[PDB]
Ligand binder design. Structure first.
Ligand code: SIA
Ligand code: SIA
Ligand code: HTQ
Ligand code: HTQ
Ligand code: HTQ
Ligand code: HTQ
Ligand code: HTQ
Ligand code: HTQ
Ligand code: NAG
Ligand code: NAG
Ligand code: NAG
Ligand code: CL
Lengths: 532, 531, 531
């Protein structure tokens, strides 16, 4: 029918209508709306700038490029995480500061539907907004869904530790996208007054970070972190970041005489060159050959003094900042298959013994950060139970998931709670039918498994059993009610308690019901073990 | 003693040149910047104000012409120039300059009428220095300004969106006019009386500016010689993304997104882009490959800043510059010059019906005649004689009418009906300065009026009495127009105003008024295209 | 606990260094940025303010020195340095830094006089890190600031127009002064009491800054050591365009226009410009061919921003804020250093009047003397007697007077006549830190006063009590001047002001007042050149 034409600050955008089985009002979908000026040339390694306005009508009907990244890794993850039946193949480009909108509202009348801005995960190295289709969630819960993109890897996080290149460019991209939503979402029938930010993994961590950043203040009113927070150490760079910067510059064929000299040279480099450098660094890949403490898993969030004035641990300790309803959750087996798979973890055996276990835990230093002097104690506290080598492996993946997501999430959850703001938690346990063929059937609640329920995968992909369909229906109700009231609860849905002193949380799965003291035992074990 | 003048951005030093018999010397200034050199980041972006210089800027040397095909550019400068010897020119992206020729007495105050010249060249080649305004300045006592603008890739690359809207060259023309309004007074010129005029692409430019709201108060009269906004070859209609992409690919750039192409194209050296230009083989009749997919030019587009609609839609709205406008054409626009420059296959010097239709199709990029209408067209023009030589000449008539004759007249009529003063002419004469390679039978070839308009007879050699007179007349007709938005004057054949009677001036050895210019042709084509 | 100071742009962290005989440690801050790195498009453009930093910048490591001949640079550093062992430096275009040495107790509120040092090196080489301000700071309780500024092509390339005015290094010097005004208070200094001083090109810089309306309020006292704005070699007169083109071609650039050259040179890499720098042989003397065509060393030009006209025209103009100015020279300015570093053909040890005139002519790029005047010049100095050996020395006194002696006095007199406190001196002493390859007969060689000024006798070893007392006295005089505009004080021989009696101080083992410095020489030359 007559295509939707929304008028924005920078110009008119033409999208398209797409109907979803069971909904009369078709959803207006806008693809590739620029929220900032392409970070090309001298704009590389600098805060994002406003997009130039355009004349006539902009055709927002093609999927935007995904920010330069490992094209193979990128696609692999996209296929593994997409909620649509046909994974969209994406093109690489530094000109990737776009966002996609899905509005279930009737643009012929004025609406103020709650807005949900999704920040994709990908270890801040890969990923894209197009991987996530917001059609189902928009129609079902009558909410405006916005998936956004931000610079990754070298382009979005290169830091020199100083003012010549603070870092966190990707994070600034995220904040810029949030301002754009403030200034334009009303045109798409959304209520700028109710913007909810939510993300998974690195996206969860980004959400966790904005919640702690003054720059993001008043840009959102509710937040959701799925399998990822600011205390998930692997994504936050503590200490002097100068060494990493130099290594990158050297690998790219640049002198390190000074900071400005390094940045100037990296700006002259072409995209293909910075990509080749990215590939040489072997990011997102477990480094077995070489000292574990020097291994650099990725380029991430730093304490730039602009976005983050100090460390997350210190930031969440304060109690004099703008608070918002925050939902933090994790999956049953955050390290059951997906992550170990992508990083090429040495587990082609199926079993593991105490001795070898202490070996991987050390090699995994860049992800867990457990001192070689604590390794023995840690590994024992987990594998000292059974003599079974197979059950040991399972407890090992438990060990890592807790350090990476479990404990960091509960702690963040607690502090937010002790800060006087509504806090909610959940533990997702369910093996989706859209899992990989290589993923063992015994893995339930793997990293990313909740994505399919959150983005209504059952209503776009085939095979979903009636059970899986309802699960997704329930999940979207919670997320959408949360977006609406800052409380997930609603009639016809299992009661979800607040994460107060009793530490109540919601176990989401075949059997969704409330529980208590999530990871209580582990938070204490690690809080002590780490305290050295 | 060297004339010096205070401009908005600093003092400039020029030179005095006297023309035969004239006591009052013409103060000439060559290579005055009117914009910041469009280099690096500034490429494919709107012209920017020039930076002021501290002391006295020496303006006594000719500026480089905008990057273009060195060969074609020189050839055209030689065929169109009106000075004795053609001057060698340098190429550069640093070409945003304008030359001034003022007959005024810079010591006292003057407000002579200003005439700004926009050279032609298909928007691909050309230069201001090609035209010496000495004769016209002295003879008609007007200040003559010749301006340059970005050409080809540099001045017209468009991604069809905000990353590279296009019409950079037209923006340069505007900036140049802007500069005249702020400085011309210092050169003895009256900024309140500015006439823009040019031929061919420069004629189309004048036409485009006459429809653009950006040039609102930048000129007061307009003259388009052999070229208007309706010469379809110069104005790209529809989506231009395809040609943008072809250019990027030819230059070794990815076409991922507009921003990607633009950025890549900016990282290219002037020389790589010129090489890309040479690769594209513009301004040449492409006899191989589908005619519908050949871009002989990179022209004007509907950018949304300079032009908000197509020139057609802009005429209808009777929404444009209601200033005195003079539109004229020459007897044989496709006489020799253009087909000669485009390597048209007419060696035999004859032409039968079939070959005519076949050639007309290949000429698609120039006339846009649907393959299904080619026969009616060829029949209407050629089915009248069995003389293969006449068919061949009638074929050049047809191309001429589609490119200039018809387009020009429709423009005049619309300009007329909008209530603004309008005038038309048809120049028919063979300048003695024509290239020796051009047959002596070609009368009123493309650009043939240039020699009268710029006083070639007074700077070059060999002009007969008849020719000398012709130039005097044309220059006066032109200068009078700049003064009153009316060409008439004492001692000049009467030029009726192009009103509903459609009176126009037939300029030549014998100059006399006539009516209904290309009237029947306009009717035929309007109908043929209505299908 | 290390020194942490807060400045407008952010917090800096230094280190304490104790000096023998002073309880309060001196806080030293190395490599604080006073401008934004002049890289990429910022090349050949005035310095821009540095960007603020978010935490505590570590300022405890020497900064790189502006790109220059690494060999000449290191050499001149070793020869001039006042510290025990010369510090090896790195080359970088990112060199706009300054070092601070404050003796003030930063936990208190001190406001001591500030002395900003501008090193020399023909504007081609040199570094701030060469001069350790420890001794001077502690001994005279003043804050010492050693600054850096762009050198060679980077700091002085000029097209003679607005596309690259030039004087970039001078604009850096001014920007360093601006920085000092906005931040020095947090280092214990009094922003209202800033004295700029330097030697050679650094002296010429001080001299230039004193005439520039750009620094009319950034300092309160000036000291030019062996070098003023009248030392022709460093200041350019006439069209500079040729030099620009010669540099552009040596770098492999087109020369179509100014913008073209500047644009192309901005695309060059630091190494490429360094390769170009070396190819030019800037500080060496050419013995072959016509001397007038010798490489005109890069230098100060009349840009129209820093200097509105030649220095000789600004001093008579009496147009420049009046501040106390101290101009001084050394006994044998062309004694050994400058010649040795320029590879002068004097290995002979003797010189007749024939080779002298030949050599003098060959010295045109330095002394700038007409060929028809060479005989007089020679005859006047060497004609005295025979003894070719005694003549080479009279030849050296010749060069010295033309480069520093005459210019200095002239400048002093003009300053004095401008009704401003003026002081002159002649340094005649041979530091024990002299090079081993320096003749024992050379006393008061170029750069010899630096060792007393920067208290070398308290950093290097072996200073005799006489040399120590000389250093104590010079520092006393300098600091006294920095805080009163008058060098005199308790425990010091009287230094008369340079009034009409032209009284100046003779500093050395024996320090006493004298009169009419180079008076006869200034007469001979002012005259000889008049012809
Ligand atoms: C008319 C048109 O194709 N618009 C498209 C633009 C252009 O492709 C870019 O601006 C490059 O020109 O942006 C998208 O491709 C994108 O980035 O997702 C989507 C949109 O459909
Ligand atoms: C002093 C001087 O030569 N000015 C001239 C400049 C320079 O030649 C270029 O900018 C290269 O510096 O530009 C012109 O040549 C030009 O292109 O029209 C004309 C002008 O008279
Ligand atoms: C917080 N993240 C966790 C551990 C560190 C970081 C990267 C990893 O990434 C993912 O799960 C992504 O989904 C991904 C990235 C790259 C390739 C494949 C998959 C998961
Ligand atoms: C084909 N697989 C081999 C043997 C059976 C099956 C599961 C096992 O994987 C794991 O325990 C981890 O889940 C893992 C580690 C590394 C890569 C992929 C998956 C490794
Ligand atoms: C409006 N223009 C007419 C027809 C289309 C366009 C190009 C052509 O150009 C010329 O006559 C130029 O004068 C030229 C260009 C290239 C080479 C030689 C001469 C004449
Ligand atoms: C016998 N002819 C002469 C020499 C070869 C052949 C074609 C040429 O004509 C052209 O190049 C022009 O295309 C032209 C000019 C004038 C009339 C007709 C055609 C003129
Ligand atoms: C007024 N100066 C004199 C003559 C021109 C100018 C530079 C020269 O050199 C020096 O002062 C340095 O001592 C130096 C720098 C670079 C190379 C060699 C020597 C001495
Ligand atoms: C390589 N040089 C040769 C032999 C050793 C050294 C000094 C000498 O120098 C001269 O004759 C100079 O003319 C001079 C230099 C320093 C002071 C006075 C005179 C000539
Ligand atoms: C927008 O782009 C799509 C796909 O590129 C195309 O099919 C559609 O026609 C365009 N919209 C219009 C009508 O301009
Ligand atoms: C400052 O830099 C110096 C030398 O680079 C280094 O030794 C010192 O540890 C640094 N100080 C701090 C604490 O950053
Ligand atoms: C133009 O005049 C300037 C200043 O007199 C001079 O430098 C330059 O050489 C002159 N150019 C010509 C055309 O001779
Ligand atoms: Cl992630």
């Amino acid at each position: 029918s007559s295509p939707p034409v929304v008028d924005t600050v920078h110009g008119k955008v033409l999208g398209k209508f797409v109907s979803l089985e069971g909904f009369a009002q078709p959803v207006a979908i806008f693809l590739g709306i620029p929220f900032a000026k392409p970070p090309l040339g001298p704009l590389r390694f600098t805060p994002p700038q406003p997009a130039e306005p355009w004349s006539f009508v902009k055709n927002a009907t093609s999927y935007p490029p995904m920010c330069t990244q490992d094209p193979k890794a990128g696609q692999l993850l996209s296929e593994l995480f997409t909620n649509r039946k046909e994974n969209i193949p994406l093109k690489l480009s530094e000109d990737c500061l776009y966002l996609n909108i899905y509005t279930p509202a009737d643009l012929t009348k004025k609406n103020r539907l709650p807005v949900m801005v999704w920040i994709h995960g990908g270890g801040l190295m890969v990923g894209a907004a197009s991987t996530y289709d917001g059609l189902a969630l928009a129609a079902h819960e009558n909410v405006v869904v916005v998936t956004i993109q931000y610079r990754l890897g070298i382009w979005g996080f290169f830091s020199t530790g100083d003012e010549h290149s603070r870092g966190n460019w990707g994070h600034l991209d995220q904040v810029a996208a949030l301002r754009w939503v403030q200034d334009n979402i009303a045109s798409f029938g959304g209520n700028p007054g109710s913007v909810t930010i939510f993300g998974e993994s690195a996206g969860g961590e980004s959400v966790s970070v904005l919640v702690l950043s003054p720059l993001a203040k008043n840009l959102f009113h509710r937040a959701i972190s799925e399998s990822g927070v600011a205390l998930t150490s692997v994504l936050v760079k503590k200490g002097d970041v100068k060494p990493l910067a130099e290594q990158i510059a050297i690998t790219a064929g640049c002198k390190t005489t000074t900071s400005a000299v390094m940045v100037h040279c990296l700006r002259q480099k072409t995209e293909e060159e910075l990509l080749e450098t990215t590939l040489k660094m072997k990011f997102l890949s477990l480094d077995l050959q070489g000292d574990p403490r020097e291994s650099q898993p990725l380029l991430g969030t730093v304490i730039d003094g602009m976005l983050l004035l100090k460390t997350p641990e210190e930031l969440q300790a304060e109690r004099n900042f703008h608070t918002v309803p925050y939902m933090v959750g994790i999956n049953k087996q955050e390290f059951g298959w997906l992550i170990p798979m992508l990083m090429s973890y040495p587990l082609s055996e199926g079993q593991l013994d105490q001795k070898t276990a202490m070996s991987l835990l050390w090699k995994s230093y860049p992800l867990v950060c457990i001192a070689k002097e604590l390794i023995p104690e840690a590994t024992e506290k987990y594998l000292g139970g059974t003599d079974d080598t197979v059950k040991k492996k399972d407890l090992f993946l438990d060990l890592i998931a807790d350090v990476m997501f479990g404990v960091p999430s509960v702690i963040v959850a607690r502090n937010h709670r002790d800060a006087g703001a509504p806090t909610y938690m959940y533990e997702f346990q369910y093996r989706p039918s859209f899992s990989s063929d290589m993923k063992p059937k015994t893995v339930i609640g793997d990293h990313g498994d909740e994505l399919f329920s959150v983005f209504g995968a059952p209503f776009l992909k085939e095979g979903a059993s009636e059970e899986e369909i309802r699960l997704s229906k329930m999940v979207m109700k919670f997320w959408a009610n949360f977006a609406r009231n800052g409380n997930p609860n609603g009639e016809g849905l299992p009661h979800w308690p607040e994460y107060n002193q009793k530490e109540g949380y919601l176990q989401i799965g075949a059997n969704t019901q409330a529980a208590q003291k999530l990871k209580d035992k582990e938070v204490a074990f690690w809080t002590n073990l780490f305290a050295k």
